[PDB]
Structure formats: C-alpha cells, structure tokens
Design a protein around this ligand. Structure first.
Ligand SMILES: [K+]
Ligand SMILES: [K+]
Ligand SMILES: [Mg+2]
Ligand SMILES: [Mg+2]
Ligand SMILES: [Mg+2]
Ligand SMILES: [Mg+2]
Ligand SMILES: [Mg+2]
Ligand SMILES: [Mg+2]
Ligand SMILES: [Mg+2]
Ligand SMILES: [Mg+2]
Ligand SMILES: [Mg+2]
Ligand SMILES: [Mg+2]
Ligand SMILES: [Mg+2]
Ligand SMILES: [Mg+2]
Ligand SMILES: [Mg+2]
Ligand SMILES: [Mg+2]
Ligand SMILES: [Mg+2]
Ligand SMILES: [Mg+2]
Ligand SMILES: [Mg+2]
Ligand SMILES: [Mg+2]
Ligand SMILES: [Mg+2]
Ligand SMILES: [Mg+2]
Ligand SMILES: [Mg+2]
Ligand SMILES: [Mg+2]
Ligand SMILES: [Mg+2]
Ligand SMILES: [Mg+2]
Ligand SMILES: [Mg+2]
Ligand SMILES: [Mg+2]
Ligand SMILES: [Mg+2]
Ligand SMILES: [Mg+2]
Ligand SMILES: [Mg+2]
Ligand SMILES: [Mg+2]
Ligand SMILES: [Mg+2]
Ligand SMILES: [Mg+2]
Ligand code: NA
Ligand code: NA
Ligand code: NA
Ligand code: NA
Ligand code: NA
Ligand code: NA
Ligand code: NA
Ligand code: NA
Ligand code: NA
Lengths: 65, 46, 93, 57
RNA sequence: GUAGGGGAGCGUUCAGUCCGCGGAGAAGCCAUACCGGAAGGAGUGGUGGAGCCGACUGAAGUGCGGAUGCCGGCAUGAGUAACGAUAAAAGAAGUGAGAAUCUUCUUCGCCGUAAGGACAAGGGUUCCUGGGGAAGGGUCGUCCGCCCAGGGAAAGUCGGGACCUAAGGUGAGGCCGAACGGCGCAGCCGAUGGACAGCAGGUCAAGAUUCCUGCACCGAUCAUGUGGAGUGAUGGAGGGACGCAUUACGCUAUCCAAUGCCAAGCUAUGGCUAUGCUGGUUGGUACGCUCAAGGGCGAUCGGGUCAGAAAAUCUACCGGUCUGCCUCAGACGUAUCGGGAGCUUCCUCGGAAGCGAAGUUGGAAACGCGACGGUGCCAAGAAAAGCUUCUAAACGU
RNA sequence: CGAGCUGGAGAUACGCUUUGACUCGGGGAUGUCCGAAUGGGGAAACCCACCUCGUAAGAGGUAUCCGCAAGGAUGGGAACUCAGGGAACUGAAACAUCUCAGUACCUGAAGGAGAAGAAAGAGAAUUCGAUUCCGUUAGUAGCGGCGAGCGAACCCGGAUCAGCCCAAUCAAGCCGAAGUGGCUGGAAAGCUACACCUCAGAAGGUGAGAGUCCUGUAGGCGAACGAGAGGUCGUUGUUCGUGAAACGAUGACUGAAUCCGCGCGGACCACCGCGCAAGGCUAAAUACUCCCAGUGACCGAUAGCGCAUAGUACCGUGAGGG
C-alpha cells in the first residue's frame, strides 16, 4: 500500500485489479457453494482494489495539475 | 355489484403518478407537502 | 472486465443434474444484457457458448419482527456450451 | 332491536339462573376383568372386555 | 333556604427557605373501631424497593357523578343468536400425543353452455418439495391459499419495444393572457387496430410454440460462384382500404353408426358363448403428369397540356388493337418422424424404464377455411407504415 | 488520541492492530439510476440513439433562454421580507357601505435577512435634516349609514448612525489538587473517629446519598491548518368613505417651463416660508428560525411533538388523514 504499491507502472495496476477480482469471484462461488472459510480474505481483497484505484487516481493530478 | 374500486395499473399510475404530479405546479405543491411533513411514501412507490 | 457481471452458481438438484449434459447455470447481474454475459462467461472458462437464456427473479421474505420483507431482485442465467464440456473443475460438485 | 333488555342483570339474579348448570358425575363401575373403571352398558375402554373380550386392546 | 353577594379555611403540583426523615428501608398501594367544626389529618400493621414529610412564603395545566363528554379496561344481554345456500353421505385402512374433519381404498351424491378447460385484466410467491401447529381457518385439525427454509420461471419467429397510426395527449417557431397559464401547424407520444419469420412431440416435484429430438422459415454480415448490369430518397402513385343483412358451392375441426380392422381376457346369476362385451381406430413434414370446389386478372402502344411542387420508363384520362392461364382450401398415394389400446420387468409402496397392433366403409357437420364470394339495402361504412412501381440527388458503369 | 477494534445487534466464524486499528476533526479521490434532469421517449428510477476518443471494456458530449468569450440562469427551502391578484363567514344583535382585511389563500422574485433610503420632506420653530425599528406623543387630531368601529403624524428620548457616483476566539485534544481505619449492609459514596485539597463545593457515573474512586470542572496548554410636470374622466393610498378635498399613484385622452424658473405648504389667491422631481447604488440598528448550546416556580408518557420514533401500521382512487 505505501510506496511499494505505486512503484509499479500504469498497466500493472489494472493487472492487480483484474487478478484480485478473479480470486474474489472464486471465493464468491465458494460462498454460495458453502465452503468459504476465509471471509477476511474477501474483505481484504475488497480493500486492496479500492487502494489500487485510489492510488492510480492520485497519480492523475500529480504531474499535470 | 361493481364496486368503486376497479384496479388498473396503467391508470393508478397515470393519475396520482410522479410525472402526473410534475406537469402542474398545483401537484408540485402536493409533492412538496408530502416531502415536508416528515418522511412519507408517494403513489408510484405503493 | 470479464470476471465481473456474474454473481453466484445456481445450487440446486436441477442445476447440478442439468450440468451433466453440458448445461450450466449461474446467477448474474439483472442490469446485464445477454451479450456481455456471453462474452464474459466465455472469457473465463475458455469455452464458446451456443445456447443462452436468462430471466429475472424477485424474492421478498422475512422471519418474525414487524419489519416485513424486501425484494432481493435476482436474475438466473443458463448457458449451453458446444461439444467440449466439463469446465474447469467446478463441473463435478 | 325489539328483543332488547331494559336494565343490566344483577350478579345475584344472573347466578340464580345458573343454578341448574351443574354437570352430573358419570356413575362409573369397576371392570371385573382388568380392574379399570368403565361406563355401564358399555365396553371397558381399557382391557376391551364385555363378557369376554370384543374390541382390540 | 335557590339565583346572588360576603367571610374564614382544607387539599394537590411546582418554587424559595428552614427543621429533617430514609437499607434496621421513602413515596405509592392495602387494612383499621383514633383525632379535628368541615374540607381532612395521624398512629400502628401489611406491601413495596427508592426517595420524601412538617412549617412558612410565592406561583398555578389545582379538587369531577353527570356534558347521548374523550381514552382505556371490564361487565349485562348467555353459554343465548348464529357457525354463511337443503349438491346428504357410508364403511374399511393408515398416520398420530390426540382424528367426524388429514392420507389411501371401495361405494354413494352434485355440476357438466358448468360447479369442465384455456386467456386478458388484476393479485404478487399464493406454485413445487420438505418441515412446522402459536395466530388466521366461523368446530376439530396430524391438514391448508397460514409459518419457516429451499427450489422453480429459459424465446430470432408467440405479447410488447428497437416499425406504424386513431381518439387523445404534446408541441420549436407562432397566436394569446395579472402571475401561474391557456391555445396551436409539422413533428413526436399514444393498442383497444395495421404489419410481421415453424410446427409436430417428449419430459423436472414445480416451466414450454421458451429447454431437446427431428425437420423448417426470416433478417443481417462475410466468403465463393453465377451474372454481366445500375442500385434507386424523408418524393409521386398504386395499395393497405374496411360496413350491415341475407345467401350458393366445396372442405375441415369435430361427432355418430356397423357383422371393417387391431388388442385384451372374462364371461355363473335364467340365457347368450360370440353376428357378445370393453378399449383403440392419426398428427407434422417431403414428394406425385394424382382428384377438386371455390377464388381474381388486362397487356402493350401512342398523344396532348393546363394534372400528381419539379421529374419519370411509374399513375389517371382520351385514342387504336386482342376460353385462357395464375392460384389451389382440402382429399388421396408413397415416404419418414412422432403419437397410439395396451403388454413386460423391477419396485425403497407404487413410480420409472422398455416395447408397440390398425387407421375401413357410410353419414352429419359451424359463428373456422377455400376468398377481398354472390345478391340486396341505406344510415354510405379510420389512418399511417411495411410492401410495389418510378424519378431527383449522389455514387458507380 | 494510546489499546483496543471487528456499526443499531443480543450470536457464531474468520480477522485487522506499535510499520499506531478504531474513534474524533479537516481536505481530496470514487459517486451506478432517478429527480430542475438537460440525447430522444417516458405511466420517475425504464426503453431506444447518434457522434467522438478506442485494446475490447469504458469514458466523454449531445436541453432551452441571454453573449465574441468567460459566465450566469430556469431547482429546492420551515418561517421571515417585498410584489402581482385578492374572499367569506363574522360585526353592525337584520343587511347593501364600512368593518372582518389588504386577514386567509394563490402566484412571482431574492437573501441570510429584506424592504426603504441621501429630500420638488416633514413642519410652523424663519426649525430639524437619509431610511428602518423601539418608547412616547395618544388613543389626541381626524375618519365614519357621524352608526358599528376604525385611527395618524410633528416635537422629544433611545438602538444604530457613511454617503459616494451618472446624463447635459470559536471545532479536535492534552494537562489537571485532596482518604484510611472501624461499624450496620447483599452491596456504601452512608454513620463514626481523624486528615487533606480548595485560581476546582457545577454536574454525571460508580452495587445507596457521592469535594479527595472515575469522567470532569477552576486554570493552563493547544497543530498540519480549517473558519471568522399639470389638467380633464374613471378610482385608489394615507386618519381621510365625495366631503370645502389637497397631494401622491394609475388606466385612457392631452400636454409646460427652466432664472425677474418650477413644486409644495389640506379648494383657491397674494404675501411669506420650505424644497429643486422625471437616473442609480448603498453596512448597521429590524424579522424569523430548519439547525446547534445553554437554561426553566416546562411535561414525566391519557403529559410532552403526532411519534421515549412512525408520518410507520392502518383508512382513502386521490388530495389527505393517522
Ligand atoms: K358359463
Ligand atoms: K366396438
Ligand atoms: Mg435458446
Ligand atoms: Mg413466507
Ligand atoms: Mg435499589
Ligand atoms: Mg382543570
Ligand atoms: Mg362519567
Ligand atoms: Mg337511553
Ligand atoms: Mg367505552
Ligand atoms: Mg343450553
Ligand atoms: Mg333468552
Ligand atoms: Mg333458545
Ligand atoms: Mg342454532
Ligand atoms: Mg343464515
Ligand atoms: Mg350450513
Ligand atoms: Mg363435510
Ligand atoms: Mg343447461
Ligand atoms: Mg409474475
Ligand atoms: Mg400447495
Ligand atoms: Mg392449531
Ligand atoms: Mg380452530
Ligand atoms: Mg426473455
Ligand atoms: Mg397544448
Ligand atoms: Mg394489441
Ligand atoms: Mg410482435
Ligand atoms: Mg413427472
Ligand atoms: Mg403447469
Ligand atoms: Mg433524460
Ligand atoms: Mg390591489
Ligand atoms: Mg358616506
Ligand atoms: Mg378609502
Ligand atoms: Mg394629482
Ligand atoms: Mg403520547
Ligand atoms: Mg397509556
Ligand atoms: Na388515612
Ligand atoms: Na407473426
Ligand atoms: Na356450407
Ligand atoms: Na353353462
Ligand atoms: Na480512543
Ligand atoms: Na352581523
Ligand atoms: Na410564497
Ligand atoms: Na381625480
Ligand atoms: Na405509568
């Protein structure tokens, strides 16, 4: 989340996005499958997506004004 | 024995409806008075 | 993207039993047309789709209390794959 | 309604009326077979006899 | 001693002040035979589980039997009247803590131009499955349209939208008005109408013209091939296009008969012994010089100017010249697919799976179809698009 | 800020937290759909488009009224302000004026306030001197089927007090003095014997009543940085209802002067006196209260808002009631 997350280029952001969304979908299938034993994993990924997007959007003003 | 009440969606909504209310200020006032005396629920919601 | 749109897999005896003949069924986003749901379903399991049919499905319940219910407004989708069946590993639950 | 009463009735009167409402106690017998109490000229609902045994226990 | 006037006080809440009480227990409630001239006050006991007397003074949302008063609770009418069409029901068996009321069986009865079936409107999970028995159910309830959870709803062609128009609604500009606003052309919205591409079957507990089995149609896009040439608007025209009454001919859905055909076995009561009894006796698609009623249809050329804004090879009008094919409701034949009385086996109680015979003759036959029929009548019976044809513009031969 | 957190939520599981979690302030980034709704249609939250930028996803734009542009406006607000329009019951113990009343309602516009405002005035002292509001004048003068009833202003006191410009400290938060024993008790903050603080004896909680147990109060500290013309005709206003009826205002006809000028001073005239329109803007003193704090000889739930939350259930086609 700190400077070790914005260090990546522009594309890798989207990459993390879609990947997390994938895993998130998996755990989500498990939810209705009656197997999900890691809710904090769901919440966590939810958080990380918002982080990524936030950050990226923060690089939208810093360097162009 | 037809009663006064003869259900019909395209009319209960045609009159008394949100847009029905908008077309005339005299209805706007109704909306306003309904959103004013506390929470309420209009006629397009029911 | 592709991984979105869908919701959860249809869990029932008819879904499971109809899965045996290469017919799949899962819940999707009501506000989702029948194209992006095809594109999406395809780009997620690596399979093309021939058959497709979805419909909307309300819900409205409650237990006790005096707080009636609420519509849960869903939409179930059913897709039919070509010759190559048994997708991933979740086709044998 | 023509059939209306003039005044409300008194507890006293309204009870005197009810002085004929007492249920009679069932006169019960002792069954000579399964020593259970039964109803005269009927069948012992317990063992099931009535001069030898008729109904299924 | 009524209306009325005058005087002295009681009681309640709040406020200031003072004296205080309270876990060994306040207020409140409950009992009581004590005190005071009244309103009232006190002692003791019981209950209670936190606060509150007395005195003085100030201020009031200050004293209730009434108002067909207001709210709430509970009585009387009384175990009374009723339990919602006079289409009665009976027995066995099962389940269960408990059955007149639920389940199963065999009878009985009632509707049958419905009390059967399928839709629109409307109601929204009431459907299906498994539980539950508080309340609802005019009695019971093990059950229910009630409670709980879970499941179920599948469309290129059926409804609607992405097409069209009517009344109506709306409406730039415009015409008007103290405001608000009211009117109004085109246009747009608006199915109750117009237009438009498939049917026949099977099958979950619960869906079907939606899923699939067979077979098929429509539009768009692309490729290949044939072809060798224009393709043709928001334009014009043609047409969609419209009634009521009666009525000829043919046919079907559908229905009836039999010593037609197929299948099943049995039939005692008195008889029949099968010329008896029961049941079944075709749907879609493709093809055929097969059978057939009915239904509606000019082409071409030429001329003029004032006609369709303009224009045209299109349309109308004027002028010359002259049975037929077109289309086939439906029937029949062949083929194929499906269906079909029932039979067979297993059975977790009764479902699933597999198999499968024949379709003959005669008669009846509509408010359906062959059609936009024929005839008669006066009250003289939407629009627009798709569709067809033909120009301009433009692009291309 | 310094150990907890994991929303009202009573429960279970998985987890986040000295690389300061939550919580409390203060700026940003994401904000589908509807709604002034504004692509078009629309029975609101639906349906259908086109164009542009393109890696598909996706994003962006596409309403109307003023302008070269920037930009601004059609929206929403409980009450309050101004404006257009404008009742009746009721009163007169009937009822026509008049009252009710420019009340209610309707509508337009705008703000945190508006209106009004820098003299063609009030007034009679040869004076005061923008406007508004408060007190008073006074319920006088005056109006009125002279009935019902309506009702100013000047002077003076006071809140606040400016005239300049065109045309020719409050929100986070931290810091913060002073008690032990014994006794009744289930449990004391009570009783009791001693002691202390007191620029803190407001108050709440803690097994009951509470200075010294807790949170706080007096007081002190406190950030990145966030706020502070005339006239005639028809009528009307002011106390003024046609009355001797001025003046202001307006609809319809007409239509003056400007320096020995023009208006006014309750028809009119002379004298005298005050004042100079037909252009505009402009704090404060004033009103009200959705919202917040504090306070109460305010209620303590048949009260108090309708609601110890609900405009819900419930009634109605609906406005609406509740
Ligand atoms: K025989
Ligand atoms: K037969
Ligand atoms: Mg399909
Ligand atoms: Mg339910
Ligand atoms: Mg206590
Ligand atoms: Mg009183
Ligand atoms: Mg009474
Ligand atoms: Mg009486
Ligand atoms: Mg009562
Ligand atoms: Mg009796
Ligand atoms: Mg009686
Ligand atoms: Mg009787
Ligand atoms: Mg009876
Ligand atoms: Mg009766
Ligand atoms: Mg009966
Ligand atoms: Mg019965
Ligand atoms: Mg009949
Ligand atoms: Mg439905
Ligand atoms: Mg059922
Ligand atoms: Mg019961
Ligand atoms: Mg009952
Ligand atoms: Mg569909
Ligand atoms: Mg109009
Ligand atoms: Mg229709
Ligand atoms: Mg259609
Ligand atoms: Mg079945
Ligand atoms: Mg069905
Ligand atoms: Mg819109
Ligand atoms: Mg006026
Ligand atoms: Mg008069
Ligand atoms: Mg007047
Ligand atoms: Mg004048
Ligand atoms: Mg109350
Ligand atoms: Mg009460
Ligand atoms: Na007493
Ligand atoms: Na059709
Ligand atoms: Na006929
Ligand atoms: Na015989
Ligand atoms: Na904290
Ligand atoms: Na009167
Ligand atoms: Na207003
Ligand atoms: Na006049
Ligand atoms: Na009470």
């Amino acid at each position: 989340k700190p400077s070790e997350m914005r260090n990546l280029q522009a594309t890798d952001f989207a990459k993390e996005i879609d990947a997390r969304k994938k895993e998130l979908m998996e755990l989500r299938f498990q939810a209705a499958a009656g197997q999900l034993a890691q809710p904090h994993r769901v919440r966590q990924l939810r958080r990380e997506v918002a982080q990524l997007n936030t950050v990226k959007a923060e690089l939208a003003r810093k360097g162009e004004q | 024995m037809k009663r006064t009440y003869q259900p019909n969606n395209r009319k209960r909504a045609k009159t008394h409806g949100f847009r029905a209310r908008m077309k005339t200020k005299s209805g706007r006032n109704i909306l306003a008075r309904r959103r004013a005396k506390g929470r309420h629920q209009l006629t397009v919601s029911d | 993207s592709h991984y979105d749109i869908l919701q959860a897999p249809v869990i029932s005896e008819k879904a499971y039993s109809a899965m045996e003949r290469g017919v799949y069924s899962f819940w999707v986003s009501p506000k989702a047309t029948k194209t992006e749901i095809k594109d999406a379903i395809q780009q997620a399991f690596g399979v093309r789709v021939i058959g497709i049919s979805t419909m909307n499905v309300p819900g409205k319940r409650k237990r006790v209390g005096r707080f009636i219910g609420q519509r849960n407004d869903r939409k179930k989708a059913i897709v039919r794959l070509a010759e190559g069946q048994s997708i991933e590993a979740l086709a044998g639950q | 309604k023509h059939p209306v009463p003039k005044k409300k009735t008194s507890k006293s009167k309204r009870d005197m009326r009810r002085s004929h409402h007492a249920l009679t106690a069932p006169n019960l017998t002792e069954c000579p077979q399964c020593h259970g109490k039964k109803l005269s000229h009927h069948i012992c609902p317990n063992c099931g006899y009535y001069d030898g045994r008729q109904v299924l226990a």
